[PDB]
Amino acid sequence: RKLGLKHSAREIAERAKVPLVPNARHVEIQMMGDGFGKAIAIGERDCSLQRRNQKVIEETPAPNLPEATRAKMRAASERLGSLLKYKCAGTVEFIYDEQRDEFYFLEVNARLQVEHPITEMVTGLDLVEWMLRIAANDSPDFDNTKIEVSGASIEARLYAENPVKDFRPSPGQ
Known about the structure:
The protein has helices at 8-15, 67-84, 116-123, 127-135; strands at 25-34, 39-51, 54-60, 87-97, 102-109, 153-156, 161-162, 168-169. The chain is of the alpha+beta class. A six-stranded antiparallel sheet has the order 5-4-1-2-3-6, sandwiched between helices. The relative contact order is 0.20. Residues 10-136 form the ATP-grasp domain.
């Protein structure tokens, strides 16, 4: 509920010290929360390649993003997740000005996301496994969890659609 309404979500973000909006990319942080105040940033994904706002290709790590601003995307995401006492998996989406080197809160998805497997490739984590373990109060011990990101990974979404006739759905056997 607190994340569903565009404006309640902005207050939490503000209180969490997450820079908000006072040629845009879409950089999101995959975060895990244990439901008891602990939160951890697992990595970031770029989801810029969208058609009329519908994602088709995603990648990790985000290209052309400096550590200074990635590490502060992570920490801002952990504050937001901590503040809520967030449980299981959520994503903090940001807008990113590549040129200005600035990012701004967009929304939290209060759920796992379609693109989650690229994160799983570079870290070797099974996020569903984590979700299950956290949801049963047998959470990984967060303060002692070292996440190593390894290589780069990208996802393409195969749709039953016709790109030539307006991405009209294409049923059949």
